[PDB]
Structures are given as structure tokens and as C-alpha cells.
Amino acid sequence: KTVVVTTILESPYVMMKKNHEMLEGNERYEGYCVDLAAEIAKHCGFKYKLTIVGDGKYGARDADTKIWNGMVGELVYGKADIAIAPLTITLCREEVIDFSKPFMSLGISIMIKKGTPIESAEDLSKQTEIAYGTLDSGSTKCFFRRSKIAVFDKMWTYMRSAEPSVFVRTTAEGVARVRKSKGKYAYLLESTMNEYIEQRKPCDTMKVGGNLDSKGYGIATPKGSSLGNAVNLAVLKLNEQGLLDKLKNKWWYDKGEC
Amino acid sequence: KTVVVTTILESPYVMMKKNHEMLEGNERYEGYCVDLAAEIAKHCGFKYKLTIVGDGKYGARDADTKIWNGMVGELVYGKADIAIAPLTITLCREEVIDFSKPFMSLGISIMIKKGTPIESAEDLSKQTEIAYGTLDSGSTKCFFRRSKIAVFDKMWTYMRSAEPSVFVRTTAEGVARVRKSKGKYAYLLESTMNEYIEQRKPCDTMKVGGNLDSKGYGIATPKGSSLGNAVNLAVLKLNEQGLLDKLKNKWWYDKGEC
Ligand SMILES: N[C@@H](CCC(=O)O)C(=O)O
Ligand SMILES: N[C@@H](CCC(=O)O)C(=O)O
Ligand SMILES: [Zn+2]
Ligand SMILES: [Zn+2]
Numbered sequence: 001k002t003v004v005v006t007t008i009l010e011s012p013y014v015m016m017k018k019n020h021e022m023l024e025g026n027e028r029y030e031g032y033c034v035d036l037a038a039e040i041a042k043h044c045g046f047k048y049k050l051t052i053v054g055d056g057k058y059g060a061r062d063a064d065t066k067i068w069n070g071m072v073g074e075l076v077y078g079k080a081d082i083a084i085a086p087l088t089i090t091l092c093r094e095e096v097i098d099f100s101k102p103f104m105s106l107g108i109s110i111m112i113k114k115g116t117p118i119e120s121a122e123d124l125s126k127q128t129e130i131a132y133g134t135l136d137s138g139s140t141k142c143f144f145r146r147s148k149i150a151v152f153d154k155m156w157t158y159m160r161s162a163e164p165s166v167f168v169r170t171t172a173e174g175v176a177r178v179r180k181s182k183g184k185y186a187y188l189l190e191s192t193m194n195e196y197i198e199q200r201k202p203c204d205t206m207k208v209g210g211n212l213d214s215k216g217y218g219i220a221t222p223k224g225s226s227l228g229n230a231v232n233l234a235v236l237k238l239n240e241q242g243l244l245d246k247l248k249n250k251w252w253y254d255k256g257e258c
Numbered sequence: 259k260t261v262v263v264t265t266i267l268e269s270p271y272v273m274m275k276k277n278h279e280m281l282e283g284n285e286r287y288e289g290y291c292v293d294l295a296a297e298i299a300k301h302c303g304f305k306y307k308l309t310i311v312g313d314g315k316y317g318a319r320d321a322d323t324k325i326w327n328g329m330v331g332e333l334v335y336g337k338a339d340i341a342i343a344p345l346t347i348t349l350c351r352e353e354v355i356d357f358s359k360p361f362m363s364l365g366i367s368i369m370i371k372k373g374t375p376i377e378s379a380e381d382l383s384k385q386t387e388i389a390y391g392t393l394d395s396g397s398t399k400c401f402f403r404r405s406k407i408a409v410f411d412k413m414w415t416y417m418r419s420a421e422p423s424v425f426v427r428t429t430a431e432g433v434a435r436v437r438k439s440k441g442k443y444a445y446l447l448e449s450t451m452n453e454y455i456e457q458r459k460p461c462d463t464m465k466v467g468g469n470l471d472s473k474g475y476g477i478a479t480p481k482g483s484s485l486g487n488a489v490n491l492a493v494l495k496l497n498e499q500g501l502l503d504k505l506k507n508k509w510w511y512d513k514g515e516c
């Protein structure tokens with residue numbers, strides 16, 4: 001009956017509303033993915049409940065157990081019916097879950113504290129004074145783990161061994177680490193999240209360089225789900241009608257503070 | 259056994275080699291989609307035959323007959339097994355054929371002769387002096403026909419009844435018309451093709467403004483084809499290993515003339 005949606009607290013995709021405690025269920029949350037879920041549900045004709053992924057992760061497979069965690073795991077093991085989140089379409093994930101055509105484009109990018117002497121990934125790789133890392137259990141880390149491209153592989157070799165550790169549990173922890181590190185920490189994260197934060201007080205970070213790759217976020221469903229077909233057509237509809245662009249302006253730039 | 263691949267002569271995706279007359283089969287052609295087809299086939303483990311679409315079109319459904327033309331038609335009517343071309347993923351097409359996840363991102367863009375006093379679609383819609391049109395039987399025309407957005411519907415209203423016709427049969431025809439028309443014709447075409455032309459002699463055109471929308475090219479197969487799954491995984495694999503970015507540089511910028 002009611003579709004269980006798994007999602008993740010990530011600004012400006014899903015955020016606890018300012019006055020949520022006096023609100024109940026889905027009304028406690030706002031954001032790009034909250035509006036998207038409402039649109040998708042409207043067009044596919046289902047009722048839904050938003051749930052925050054229990055382990056707070058996007059999804060990766062444990063090398064030893066082979067068990068998936070995060071939102072991907074919640075789909076794989078039957079704990080949720082659909083994931084509506086900034087979840088990156090990847091080869092490894094497509095092997096175990098289904099994705100709609102992308103609803104948003106992104107690439108890996110570099111976040112620095114304003115004034116930091118870094119302009120590119122190549123820059124980061126040719127030095128050591130400034131440490132840099134990525135999010136745990138996500139596609140950015142996996143991208144670096146598996147890249148045969150010379151510059152990226154060298155970055156991965158430094159990251160996988162550094163001490164203290166350069167990886168963070170949440171995007172917020174990575175951003176805070178940049179802001180409090182006096183320019184000695186740079187954070188590798190998706191351009192969407194980088195560009196959003198850049199327009200938020202205290203206005204002390206910025207995106208530098210071009211994107212390191214090009215990929216997309218998709219709405220994910222359990223493999224063979226009956227929901228997959230309708231959801232895909234809905235994403236295409238919403239893109240063609242300009243809604244996806246409308247939502248993007250609503251949450252990134254109509255909400256800039258800088 | 260041998261996979262029949264439908265494609266289209268559109269630079270720099272698929273072009274006739276200089277000595278093509280002395281060459282046979284797939285060796286007659288070169289370009290981004292030629293390189294891509296060789297890779298998709300290698301990774302999916304199939305032999306293939308490139309064939310240029312007979313009517314030279316991408317694909318639209320005739321309002322009267324209801325028959326699909328172009329590469330889309332070749333797939334729908336069983337004349338080809340797969341399309342490897344700059345074929346835009348759209349809702350109407352997804353209803354009749356299957357698409358892989360996108361292999362390239364693009365948006366509708368504006369091409370002007372250098373010096374043309376136009377900076378945006380809004381600029382174009384608000385005037386009469388400079389004519390503008392699009393390709394026939396393609397996703398750009400359909401975009402404008404179907405659009406509810408104010409600026410774009412105004413453009414469609416003008417274009418559909420402009421005389422002489424502002425629509426062209428091939429991208430090359432639209433580009434020639436821009437070049438020959440002394441700034442009095444602007445051409446709406448995808449950013450990928452606009453960007454390519456900008457780097458070709460006589461270096462007299464350019465892309466102006468931002469993209470009007472955001473979408474992707476996919477590799478297409480007949481609905482329910484068993485090739486679809488493998489092709490999709492190959493596209494993701496090839497993106498993650500950086501092949502797609504490498505091919506774009508090779509055919510757009512390494513060969514740039516301006
Ligand atoms: N979008 C990523 C999470 C953020 C990141 O890895 O940078 C994923 O789906 O895993
Ligand atoms: N890529 C387009 C053709 C070019 C255009 O319409 O501008 C299509 O698949 O129809
Ligand atoms: Zn709607
Ligand atoms: Zn010839």
C-alpha cells in the first residue's frame with residue numbers, strides 16, 4: 001500500500017524543516033528531494049512515507065562480507081521500496097538495484113577554504129601540506145579507489161593511507177573540517193553539494209577547478225520492482241516540463257545567502 | 259548473429275573517411291560514435307555492421323500516418339538491432355524503444371554568426387529581424403512544439419508559421435544558413451553540435467547564452483531487446499573508466515581549428 005521511501009539528510013535535498021516538531025510524518029521535511037518525491041508519487045499514483053536511512057549512508061559493499069549498507073542496502077534487503085535521494089548511478093550499483101534515467105547531473109569537484117593555494121586535482125596531487133579526503137561509503141570514494149587515470153590513482157594512494165584519516169562519515173563533517181582547518185584540508189565532493197554550500201553563510205568555501213567526471217543521480221528501486229517503469233517515465237516527464245529545473249533554482253539559487 | 263547498428267552522418271559522430279571508397283564495411287567510417295560502437299561491441303561481445311539510416315533522420319512520429327521515421331523507425335520496425343548515435347533520450351521515444359543510461363550530456367543551445375546582437379532565447383523571442391529555426395524530425399523541434407514555458411512557446415508560435423520555412427533537413431544545412439545569412443538567421447541545436455562547429459573553420463559562429471534544457475544521448479535498442487542490459491552496463495563502465503571524456507576531447511578539441 002504505502003510506499004516506503006528511503007532517503008538521507010543531505011542539504012538541500014532533504015532537511016528537517018525549521019518547525020518540524022509540531023509537524024508529523026512527511027511534513028517534517030523539506031527540500032529538492034522532498035518536492036521530487038511528491039511529484040513522482042503524484043504521477044505514479046502512490047501514497048508514501050519518507051524514512052531516513054538508518055545507517056546514514058549512501059551505499060557501498062563490504063569487501064569481506066559482501067553485504068551492502070546505506071540506502072542501497074535498504075533496497076537490496078527489502079527494507080524500503082524506493083530511494084529518492086542524491087544517489088549516484090554507478091556500474092556496481094546497477095548490478096544489484098535499478099535506476100531511473102538521471103534527474104540531475106553532477107561531477108566530482110574540489111572544495112577549499114577561500115584563499116587556499118589549490119586550483120586543480122593535479123595541484124592537490126603534487127603536494128602534501130594540504131590534506132584532502134572524501135565521504136565514506138559513497139560513489140566519490142569508490143571512484144578514486146577504482147580509477148586507472150594517473151592523477152586520480154595517485155590521489156587515492158595518498159588518501160587510503162594518510163594519518164590521521166582524511167575520510168569523513170557525512171558531508172557535513174567534511175564541510176566543517178574544511179571550514180575549521182585554516183586551509184589545510186580540502187574536500188572532494190559532488191558539484192551539486194559544493195555549489196550549494198558555496199552560496200551559504202559563512203560564505204567561506206568555494207569550488208575550484210573543473211569537475212573530475214560527469215555522472216548523474218537516479219531514483220532507485222529494487223531489481224525487478226514493478227515501480228521502476230512508472231518512476232522512469234515520470235522523471236523524463238518532469239525534466240521535459242521544466243519542473244526539475246524549477247526545483248533546482250528553488251533550492252540552490254533562490255536560497256543563496258552570499 | 260551480426261548486430262545491425264543504425265547510425266547517422268553527423269559530424270563528428272559519424273563521418274565518411276577520406277579514402278572511404280577504397281575501404282570496406284565498418285572501416286569506411288570514423289568519428290566519436292564509430293569509436294564508441296567498436297567499444298560497446300567489444301565489451302558486450304558481439305560483431306556488428308554499421309549502417310547509415312536511409313532517410314537521414316533522427317526520428318519523429320508522423321502526426322497523420324502515425325509511422326515512426328529515422329533511426330527510431332529503424333528500431334521500431336525491426337530494420338536494426340541497435341542505434342549508436344547522438345540520439346536524445348525523450349519520453350515519447352522511451353514509450354516505443356529502450357535507452358541506455360546517457361553517454362553524453364547536452365542541452366538545446368543557440369548558434370549565431372559572430373557579431374549577431376543576440377544573447378539569449380529571451381532576446382530571440384522578443385524580436386523579428388533575426389529569423390531562427392531548428393532541425394526537422396528531431397528532439398529540438400519536438401521540445402519547442404510541446405513546451406508550456408512562456409519564452410519557448412512564443413518561439414514555437416513564431417517558428418511554426420515563419421515563411422520561408424526556418425526549419426532545415428540536416429544540421430549542416432542549418433549551419434550553412436547561419437554562415438550565409440549575414441547575422442539574420444540563428445540556429446537552435448544541441449550544445450554538443452554547437453560546440454563542435456565553433457571549433458571548425460571558418461570559425462565564424464559561436465554558442466551564446468546558457469543551455470535551454472538538460473538531457474542526454476542514449477544507446478537505443480528495440481523494446482525488450484536482450485542486448486539492452488549489457489549495453490547499459492557497458493556505457494556505465496566506459497564512463498567510469500574515462501573513455502567517454504577521452505573520446506570527446508579527441509573529436510571536439512584535439513582536432514579544433516580555431
Ligand atoms: N552521491 C554519492 C554520495 C556523495 C559522494 O560520494 O560524494 C553516492 O550516491 O554515493
Ligand atoms: N539529437 C536530436 C537531433 C538534433 C536536434 O534535434 O537538435 C535527436 O535525437 O532528435
Ligand atoms: Zn507534476
Ligand atoms: Zn565520399
Ligand SMILES: [Zn+2]
Pocket residue numbers: 297300301
Ligand atoms: Zn575497452
